[PDB]
Design a protein around this ligand. Sequence first.
Ligand SMILES: O=c1[nH]cnc2c(Sc3ccc(Oc4c(F)c(F)c(F)c(F)c4F)cc3/C=C/P(=O)(O)O)c[nH]c12
Ligand SMILES: O=c1[nH]cnc2c(Sc3ccc(Oc4c(F)c(F)c(F)c(F)c4F)cc3/C=C/P(=O)(O)O)c[nH]c12
Ligand SMILES: O=c1[nH]cnc2c(Sc3ccc(Oc4c(F)c(F)c(F)c(F)c4F)cc3/C=C/P(=O)(O)O)c[nH]c12
Ligand code: NA
Ligand code: NA
Lengths: 285, 282, 283
Amino acid sequence: NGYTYEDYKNTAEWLLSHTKHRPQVAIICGSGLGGLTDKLTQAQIFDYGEIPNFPRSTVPGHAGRLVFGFLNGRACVMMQGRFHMYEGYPLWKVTFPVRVFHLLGVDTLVVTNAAGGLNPKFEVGDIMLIRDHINLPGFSGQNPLRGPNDERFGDRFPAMSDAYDRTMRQRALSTWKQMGEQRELQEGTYVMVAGPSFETVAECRVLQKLGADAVGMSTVPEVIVARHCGLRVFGFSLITNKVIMDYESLEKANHEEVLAAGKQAAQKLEQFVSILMASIPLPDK
Amino acid sequence: GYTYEDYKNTAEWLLSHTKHRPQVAIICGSGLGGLTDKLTQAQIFDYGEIPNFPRSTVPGHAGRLVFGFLNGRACVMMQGRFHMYEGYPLWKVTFPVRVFHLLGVDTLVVTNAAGGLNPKFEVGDIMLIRDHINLPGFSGQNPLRGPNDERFGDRFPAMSDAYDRTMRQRALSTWKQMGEQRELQEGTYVMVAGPSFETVAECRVLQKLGADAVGMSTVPEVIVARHCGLRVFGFSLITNKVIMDYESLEKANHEEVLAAGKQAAQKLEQFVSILMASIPLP
Amino acid sequence: GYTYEDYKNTAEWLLSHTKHRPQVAIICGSGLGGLTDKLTQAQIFDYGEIPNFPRSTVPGHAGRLVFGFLNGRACVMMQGRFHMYEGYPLWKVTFPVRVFHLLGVDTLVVTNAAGGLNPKFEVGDIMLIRDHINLPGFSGQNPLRGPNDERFGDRFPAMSDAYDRTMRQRALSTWKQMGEQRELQEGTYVMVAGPSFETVAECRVLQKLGADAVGMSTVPEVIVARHCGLRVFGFSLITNKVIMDYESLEKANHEEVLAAGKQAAQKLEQFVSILMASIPLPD
Ligand SMILES: O=c1[nH]cnc2c(Sc3ccc(Oc4c(F)c(F)c(F)c(F)c4F)cc3/C=C/P(=O)(O)O)c[nH]c12
Ligand SMILES: O=c1[nH]cnc2c(Sc3ccc(Oc4c(F)c(F)c(F)c(F)c4F)cc3/C=C/P(=O)(O)O)c[nH]c12
Ligand SMILES: O=c1[nH]cnc2c(Sc3ccc(Oc4c(F)c(F)c(F)c(F)c4F)cc3/C=C/P(=O)(O)O)c[nH]c12
Ligand code: NA
Ligand code: NA
């Protein structure tokens, strides 16, 4: 299947008529930010299943949630969880919410994730501001824009060379500076791979040689649709593990360690984003 | 997928609806739409009247098959080509090449627009396609995926000799004989699916791989053509230099591509028309 | 699109139709189908007659599971693997591996035909697979894609240790104490979808990525086996040297790869039989 413009329209107008909230900022909560909805005021919760056209979470855990409220005084719409390719979702389902956000009047997307460090400078618990991406699925046909283009969203052939807003990154660094934290923020290129299996050593070397600083399984498709629509985009990676890059290492990527990294970073990440909210540019006069 | 009878039905319909017996198929990429103007004794078919032929489901652009003589060479020209980014399966993109084979065509000329990755290239350059990197193909988006039909070709066709050496030497010589000074480029075309343009990081990847130009077409048609045994010649119009640093304000856009096309139209149409005399006879 | 109950039904059907209890699964690559003849007490099942099993769709394609003993070790052989280029989805290509797991198999041996990228390789060489590059996997053609079930494995299994170090050692040891002419090669297998062979520029890309051999199979079976916790090892027979530069009259062709996988193929088959004795017993 796909979605028509009318489908997005009906979802948007249904949400506009069922909440008083008028979000400026969309937060898609990746690994470690599950709990960020807890810091919202005047929170209003919709299960994906209540929302017309909205893909249902078919994965273990709670019904996926769209939550409207104020984060540090700023009108937010928050996706508690996101869809992954590795779960069997087509990219036109993964990115469905980004079109709806656009039609609600959102002008800014915050997108976070977990990723493996490819840059040897990176340490577990580091935060990497996404400055650029390598869409490996994109190269082969797995681009969320594949299909007919609606001129109501954007151009047939949108540019991605300016996708990661300079100002948002400037203000992430300021916020971080004023937290007087010990470690610098990192900044680099995120490469998307479909996953869900972790890289071989030979694969890690490929991604290093390609110039990737971190690797994960999400985010790029949401960024491409956001940019098609004209939203400004801010992203970062929690570095949950250092990808294994030689045959002599005794270490090995694993689910238990990357869960532990998320759980440990979780409150630091909520603190970071809660404060950053205060510094997000206002809608344009 | 199509059955073998589906291809035979379409080829039979065309052969009984036109008297034309094309030797050469020309797939007009951006910059070359107007090449049909140079045909004589033209005979026209909307894709929509041609049995089994894929159309656009966008009323924006329909498509035409045009039979005619180009500089006295019997030709069939696709005006409007199918792209993976539009949501066509590759077995639809490449459907026409199968039909051309069954019409008796023995040479495919394929042209496109491409972003320049080789820093030697300028906007408005023509690059002869010497070789390709098929990134979608590596992942399973190869037009031969599925059952193989020996009436077309082998299970496992070689692509190491896809781009006819003789036609490229004759294209270079023709470009000089025409008294053109700004030289013909030659190099490696990488297909990416698009339709969004590359990030800086992606551009750097495509350069590290050894690609000289990047586009969103052509490689599937070339693979199916070589599977069928067609001789293949092609080139890219360098419509833009791909952004390779973070400071430049240039953003790749459709308007640059359109505008580079119109500017190069007269020159490319002349080049292809005159090249027809270099194509070996059947 | 099966659930755990489907794989279980298939395994129980096999358990109740043969007394054979395999420890080792062998997937026989192109030109290596002779290995089923080295089985003792052989028992054949056509894929057609196995519940839920994907049917192979080419007129003359051997779709048979063969249970037996190879050099005195209980095993099950696939004669004819499924290939993504034939049009099979990876969940079909790898359904037998999940069934082997439920049958109690703890080891998978994978064999294939590969094009040589390493200029040191010669046609007929055997390359012990040390590592792989899953190019289809990067893009979404990963056989774990979709719902995960822990009766198979983890949502995010590691692949950096896929190729069993113990069986590496013993393959190198066994090969030496056979006094063979050429050495056993080792290196990285890159999977491409095919079915068309590589351009020179594609060749050069795969070499730049650090691949030693290229083919169109194997990696997805390895991923599903490691997901399930099976020990894995495997071999490429080098059927052809990939054309890596424009000064050359050679062309990789179906006929020259067919002929090469009738030559030192029987060498790899004897080597696989011998190495059965080096596979550890189950606890
Ligand atoms: O080396 C690597 N290679 C390739 N990819 C990767 C990834 S992506 C990933 C890997 C594991 C995972 O599990 C959890 C998890 F389930 C939690 F609940 C959690 F808190 C947590 F930190 C995790 F890491 C989530 C995600 C990424 C989801 P998303 O954030 O992109 O939506 C991490 N490291 C590597
Ligand atoms: O930097 C680059 N990166 C990756 N790819 C490219 C391409 S390929 C391309 C990009 C845009 C485009 O826009 C149209 C278009 F779609 C029309 F239909 C049209 F009439 C028209 F004028 C255009 F400008 C056409 C084509 C090329 C089609 P083709 O020649 O392969 O058939 C050019 N530059 C880059
Ligand atoms: O240069 C290369 N590039 C990319 N890929 C490759 C391959 S993989 C391959 C290529 C051709 C082929 O055909 C047969 C065949 F059909 C038989 F019946 C046969 F006996 C036989 F020896 C062949 F070579 C089989 C396979 C491999 C299947 P598998 O071993 O993985 O299952 C080999 N060389 C290259
Ligand atoms: Na000649
Ligand atoms: Na690649």
